[PDB]
């Protein structure tokens, strides 16, 4: 069912229920639970991590993943192995770092070519995309998170694919990655439980933006002062979000696009419905992330079309699906909170200045040092202007 | 059963089920739940916090702890008192601070003697240990967290003991604190549920390190550029962790030890098994943290020996044990996450610059001020080189 091989050489299949999860740009991940048996013994007693799993979904979808977590429990006179795994087109990026500090202006192809140095994978952009400047390179950082920053600046979304060729993974970078899908949904036919959530606690009608003042000014608001607003503003009225304070961008064409993007990203709609697969009927609905879909729930006020952003498959044996879960538009309110928490908890404990007993000594020492050197610089300025 | 006394004078016993927890270096803690009775009335209605608890484990283990939390619930025509407590060889450290900012080079005995000033407790190192330099003292900080930093630099582990003498607590500082233990374990005899967890999401085969460049350079990689790797690398291959960027260490002998320590700390194995005490048989297995133990689970592929890192006792009455829980090697995956979260949540809210509505004003103001003073300094440099 599931062909797993060491990092050197031959394969071996095992039957086990799988739980895969795929997002548009975020890392995909799977999980499963092997158990000891008369079969599987030679494997289960001999798996070391970074075992290479593949041939999920049968004799197709040869998307090769790698295990990183390994649990081993004892049940009766046998033993379980829960385990986790991640993509090679993502892990292979988490392999390598870059030490040369990228800095300055950077066109997109140059940037996403220097980071694909030695990995072997390939990138390509579809539409014309502008260029910007990256302040400090991640000398002690992965290729992955610099890929994150690059997507945040230039290519707002992406999609990988195992091309026909061996050891190749084309990264189609694109804003708002999508493909049409023939299938569809409705409350009656494929949508058991439709949770429509409309979160708006950080939302906006008009908004201000400042983005060409030099690095040393910070508020003497030169640099394309403007405020924009969306169409819905006129009935809701005067509100506004955190203005686009940070910016070294010259033109005004940018200052409206980024600004309206700051607006329309905030009136959030997460549809964490549930999907239930029909095999004997409607088989042509294998959900895949980053596709278009036309949902329609009667008695809800809903017929529009949306895009998948999260999908969650399970597959017991023979790669037959049991159920699906999906989320549309924004991935969740939930997962946004959880990522916020985990980012806080990992950014912290990666630092070293933290001292829980009276913190801010490390920050206040720094800030007072800064103001003191500024005072000394003032003295130097006066003393030099004297001469 | 449990002799508790005010901070001034006489004792009073109470019977109550206790839940103790002991780690190697981390603070131990206990918890228990007294209830109103015809007995215990004079006490329970008259406990104030920092009541001094002792004589746990009977007429032995006179490890005197102190209460800091006090809950009081109403059950029927009676009342409960849940409560928590902590060690005096740790709380007595959380008592006192140091205001003189320790700074500069520091030999270990000097450092761990200036911090034991007025506490009365005693420290000693067993093996020869090098010395380093501490950048800023914790003028507004506990003796405890400076003890933490000191252990992080020089003495990578420790172990306290109530010596025979009164009001004395010897801190045997040591790397990898351990003592042999005659007892042992196996799946059949003492290990009900063996959860072996092998976490590797931040792991390494080779690794780079930079540690003698001066404070003002930050990447012009002078200072013992090197990359090392472990023995298992050759089959897993090219990966690497966050390089040892931060460092003011001259020699190369250090740069391999610390580096391989960064490696081998990361392929993590947490064995959060469960222990069940046999009283009529096998009584000589009172588990204590920071000891060696030889586990062996058949049908698992396991006969090696490990060390305890966490233990969790309970004792109903007459100081008879009911069950034990323990964790081996690294204390958990779980508790690492939870400590990460709580460190984030307490480091935050100890600060004052935080403003949830558009943060980064406090950081960007600072950074732009820094670049502006650097620009002014450039002007001064040019204007002085003129003269």
């Amino acid at each position: 069912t599931i062909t797993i091989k060491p990092p050197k050489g031959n394969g071996a299949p095992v039957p086990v229920e799988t739980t895969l999860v795929k997002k548009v740009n975020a890392d995909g991940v799977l999980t499963f639970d092997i158990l000891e048996n008369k079969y599987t013994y030679e494997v289960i007693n001999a798996i070391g991590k970074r075992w290479i799993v593949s041939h999920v979904e049968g004799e197709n979808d040869k998307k090769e993943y790698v295990i990183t977590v390994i649990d081993r429990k004892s049940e009766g006179d046998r033993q379980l192995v829960e385990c986790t795994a991640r993509e090679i087109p993502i892990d292979k990026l988490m392999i390598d770092r870059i030490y040369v500090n990228v800095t300055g202006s950077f066109t997109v192809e140059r940037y996403f070519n220097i980071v694909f140095q030695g990995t072997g994978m390939l990138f390509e952009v579809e539409g014309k995309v502008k260029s910007s400047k990256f302040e400090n390179g991640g000398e002690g950082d992965t290729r992955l998170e610099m890929f994150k920053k690059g997507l945040e600046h230039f290519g707002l979304e992406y999609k990988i694919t195992y091309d026909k060729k061996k050891d190749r993974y084309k990264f189609v970078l694109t804003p708002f990655a999508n493909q049409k899908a023939s299938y569809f949904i409705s409350d009656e036919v494929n949508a058991n439980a439709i949770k429509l959530e409309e979160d708006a606690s950080d939302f906006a009608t008009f908004i201000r933006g400042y983005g060409n003042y030099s690095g040393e000014e910070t508020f003497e608001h030169a640099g394309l002062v403007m405020e924009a607003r969306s169409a819905l503003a006129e009935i809701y009225g005067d509100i506004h979000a955190e203005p686009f304070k940070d910016g070294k961008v010259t033109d005004q064409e940018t200052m409206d696009k980024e600004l309206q993007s700051r607006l329309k990203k905030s009136l959030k709609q997460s549809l964490s419905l549930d999907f239930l697969v029909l095999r004997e009927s409607y088989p042509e609905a294998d959900p895949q992330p980053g596709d278009i879909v036309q949902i329609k729930s009667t008695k809800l006020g809903l017929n529009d079309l949306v895009r998948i952003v999260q999908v969650k498959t399970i597959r017991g044996i023979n790669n037959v699906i049991v159920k699906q879960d999906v989320t549309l538009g924004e991935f969740n309110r939930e997962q946004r909170y959880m990522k916020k928490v985990n980012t806080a908890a990992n950014y912290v404990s990666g630092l070293n200045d933290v001292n829980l007993s009276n913190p801010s000594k490390a920050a206040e020492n720094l800030k007072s040092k800064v103001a003191s050197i500024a005072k000394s610089t003032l003295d130097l300025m006066s003393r030099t202007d004297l001469i | 059963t449990i002799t508790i006394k005010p901070p001034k004078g006489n004792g009073a016993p109470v019977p109550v089920e206790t839940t103790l927890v002991k780690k190697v270096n981390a603070d131990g803690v206990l918890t228990f739940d007294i209830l109103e009775n015809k007995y215990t009335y004079e006490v329970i209605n008259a406990i104030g916090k920092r009541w001094i608890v002792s004589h746990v484990e009977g007429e032995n283990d006179k490890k005197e702890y102190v209460i800091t939390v006090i809950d009081r619930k109403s059950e029927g025509d009676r009342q409960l008192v849940e409560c928590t407590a902590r060690e005096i060889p740790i709380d007595k450290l959380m008592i006192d601070r140091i205001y003189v900012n320790v700074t500069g080079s520091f030999t270990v005995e000097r450092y761990f003697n200036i911090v034991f000033q007025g506490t009365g407790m005693l420290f000693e190192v067993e093996g020869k240990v090098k010395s380093s330099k501490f950048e800023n003292g914790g003028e507004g900080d506990t003796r405890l967290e400076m003890f933490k930093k000191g252990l992080e630099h020089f003495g990578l582990e420790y172990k306290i003991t109530y010596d025979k003498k009164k009001d004395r607590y010897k801190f045997v500082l040591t790397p990898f604190a351990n003592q042999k233990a005659s007892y042992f374990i196996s799946d059949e005899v003492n290990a009900n549920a063996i959860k072996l967890e092998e976490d590797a999401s931040d792991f390494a085969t080779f690794i780079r390190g930079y540690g003698n460049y001066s404070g003002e350079e930050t990447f012009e990689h002078a200072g013992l550029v090197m990359e090392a790797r472990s023995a298992l690398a050759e089959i897993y291959g090219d990966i690497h962790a966050e390089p040892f960027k931060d460092g003011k260490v001259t020699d190369q002998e250090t740069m391999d030890k610390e580096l391989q320590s960064r490696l081998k700390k990361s392929l993590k194995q947490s064995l959060s098994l469960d222990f069940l005490v046999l009283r009529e048989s096998y009584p000589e297995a009172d588990p204590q943290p920071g000891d060696i133990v030889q586990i062996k689970s058949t049908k698992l592929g396991l006969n090696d020996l490990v060390r305890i890192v966490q233990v969790k006792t309970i004792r109903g009455i007459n100081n008879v044990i009911v069950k034990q829980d323990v964790t081996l090697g690294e204390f958990n995956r779980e508790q690492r996450y939870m400590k990460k979260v709580n460190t984030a949540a307490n480091y935050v809210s100890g600060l004052n610059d935080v403003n949830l509505s558009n943060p980064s004003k406090a950081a960007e103001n600072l950074k732009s001020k820094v670049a502006s003073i650097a620009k002014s300094t450039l002007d001064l440099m040019s204007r002085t080189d003129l003269i």
Binding site: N25, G28, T68, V69, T84, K148 | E334
Partner: peptide, 20 residues
């Protein structure tokens, strides 16, 4: 009392592969 551990354990599981 028994319950906090299961949720926190699944949370730490989720901390694996949550980030690009």
């Amino acid at each position: 009392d028994a319950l906090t551990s299961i949720v926190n354990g699944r949370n730490a599981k989720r901390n694996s592969e949550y980030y690009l």
